[PDB]
Specification:
The structure is a homodimer of 304-residue chains. Chain A starts with 10 loop residues before the first helix and ends with a helix. The first copy, chain A, folds into 3 domains: 112 residues, Trypsin-like serine proteases (Thrombin, subunit H, Beta Barrel); 85 residues, Thrombin, subunit H; 104 residues, main proteinase (3clpro) structure, domain 3, CATH 1.10.1840.10. In chain A, helix 3 runs parallel beside helix 6, helix 3 packs across helix 7 and helix 3 runs parallel beside helix 8. Chain A contains 8 helices and 13 strands. The longest helix of chain A is centred in the C-terminal third of the chain and has 14 residues. The radius of gyration of chain A is 21 Å and the shape is elongated. Helices cover 23% and strands 26% of the residues of chain A. In chain A, the strands form 2 sheets. A 7-stranded antiparallel sheet of chain A has the order 5-4-1-2-3-7-6, with no helix packed on it. In chain A, strands 8, 9, 10, 11, 12 and 13 form a 6-stranded mixed sheet that branches. Chain A is an alpha+beta fold and 304 residues long. The complex binds 1-[(2~{S})-2-methylmorpholin-4-yl]-2-pyrazol-1-yl-ethanone (2 copies). One 1-[(2~{S})-2-methylmorpholin-4-yl]-2-pyrazol-1-yl-ethanone binds next to loops of chain B.
Chain lengths: 304, 304
């Protein structure tokens, strides 16, 4: 029993983290096979960052200008290329700790683990969600860029995020490992405002299921609803619309608990309209939306 | 910016987790040097657990009855001993991945990371606190016993917890790595009720400091208080008494923010008496108490 905000074990990713230095900028790189992946803004002065022309800045950079340190040993850079907003530094040594891996681009509402690193060294691990506005709410200080987000699915480390930026509102923006930003964000120190940070409804419902499975049941009510009725209330509360695809995804949790998904929607509707009245669910005073239905099943079943 | 419930990177502990089987009970062991540490209840039938005599049950056990598997390779058990509520299984192979380590017994209010494991395989990592009633609020399914709690301090993995039990109220009890339970709990399937789960005041104050450092400042008020005045309100709200030792520990966060500790106490006092009024602090609708002052400094400074 018990339900925790749980990250994946980070060891497989720890073994991939290196330090990348260009001039006096140090940040983190990801070493898979004989490639090191890092934010292309490693090449920028903080002045460069106001309006960087990356292709022009890169002309001034040779392989020997990229210093890559794995622990306290230097890796030899034998090639570099820019792919979207990441650099790929080809090194002469394959990472001997390279796990089985994939690069995946996740959808808003999908969760992942972040291994926060500084100078290529792991400081901590936490669980994030890709917000509906394509920001994440991380914990990232200067030096943390190139820290990665990942899931460990089916004996494969799926890398989904690399840290690039903090917006003026202190939320975070980054890329997939092909260097494509999530959302409309750019690696430039300019006015970038995030859109509405809506609640990930399907994740809230998953977490209410987790709550019932762990004996937190006070919020279960005598009502049901329809997707259309529920969605009218969701819209009003800045919740994401629930689709039949979401209802299908919650099927296994519905089965396990015997609570129809639309009944749980009507319980969520009353929680929105009535509030928590000073009560908690799984030790939270607000409705948690950074657990996917897959996360709830995984944690409630003990997958390794 | 940003402040996350962050666990230590788990790789150093992942490399220590093994499977221990006695008859048809499988749980987790910790492999350091040539010793495997596991809950002594590995030897019990679920019937045994109602009133176990461990010394008597152990007479029936030989080295060859303890099956220890590290990945998919069997370790040879060449000795076993009971120390308090743990077994120490001496194996013929030193763990080649043994990190620098210490065994420490933590105090209530101290936080640590748990690597939840099943069949000796890591499933996830999360941050816990030793509650003032010497329980933890974990996430532990059948098979998770022998999962460990740890801190990584000063290039040393300090193991502080091994999972043994779930109480009927679904909170958790375990031992240090010398096999001594935290609190009054025993490894027997009997009525064990936890005491008052008080809020860890010094940790709440640390987290309010973290909130100010990360720009969440709405709760800062125009008042101060004294330890005695504050403690009268704390007592009423089931908060731990604040001591001058706690005030001293918060000194660096006071200095960094320029908010006197007693001013922050008076802000906390108003939050208790007035409530959150539907507002959040660092994305929480309740006052978080599972960050120590050391955790706030570490995360706000980027220690690796
Ligand atoms: C030779 C490498 C392989 N490693 C793995 O994690 C393999 N792996 C990935 C997913 C499942 N298993 C890390 C350390 O050394
Ligand atoms: C030979 C072992 C050593 N390991 C360490 O983590 C060492 N270490 C502990 C604290 C800081 N460093 C794990 C893998 O192989």
């Amino acid at each position: 029993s018990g339900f925790r905000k749980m990250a994946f074990p980070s060891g497989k990713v720890e073994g991939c983290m290196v330090q990348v230095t260009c001039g006096t900028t140090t940040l983190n790189g990801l070493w898979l096979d004989d490639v090191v992946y890092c934010p292309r803004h490693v090449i920028c002065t903080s002045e460069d960052m106001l309006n960087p022309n990356y292709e022009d800045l890169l002309i001034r950079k040779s392989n020997h200008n990229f210093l890559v340190q794995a622990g306290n040993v230097q890796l030899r850079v034998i090639g570099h290329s820019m792919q979207n907003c990441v650099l790929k530094l080809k090194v002469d040594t394959a990472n001997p700790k390279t796990p089985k891996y994939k690069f995946v681009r996740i959808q808003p509402g999908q969760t992942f683990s972040v291994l926060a690193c500084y100078n290529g060294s792991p400081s901590g691990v936490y669980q994030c969600a890709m917000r509906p506005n394509f920001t994440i709410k991380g914990s990232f200080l200067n030096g943390s860029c190139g820290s990665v987000g990942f899931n460990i699915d089916y004996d494969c480390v799926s890398f989904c995020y690399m840290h690039h930026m903090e917006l003026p509102t202190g939320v975070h923006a980054g890329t997939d490992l092909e260097g494509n930003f999530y959302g409309p964000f750019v690696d430039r120190q300019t006015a970038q405002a995030a859109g509405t940070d809506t609640t990930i409804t399907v994740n809230v419902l998953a977490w209410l299921y987790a709550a019932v499975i762990n004996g937190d049941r006070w919020f279960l009510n005598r009502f049901t609803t329809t997707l259309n009725d529920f969605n009218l209330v969701a819209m009003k509360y800045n919740y994401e619309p629930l689709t039949q695809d979401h209802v299908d995804i919650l099927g296994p949790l519905s089965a396990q608990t015997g609570i129809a998904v639309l009944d749980m929607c009507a319980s969520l509707k009353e929680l929105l309209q009535n509030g928590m009245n000073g009560r908690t669910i799984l030790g939270s005073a607000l409705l948690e939306d950074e657990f996917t239905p897959f996360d709830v099943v995984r944690q409630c079943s003990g997958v390794t």
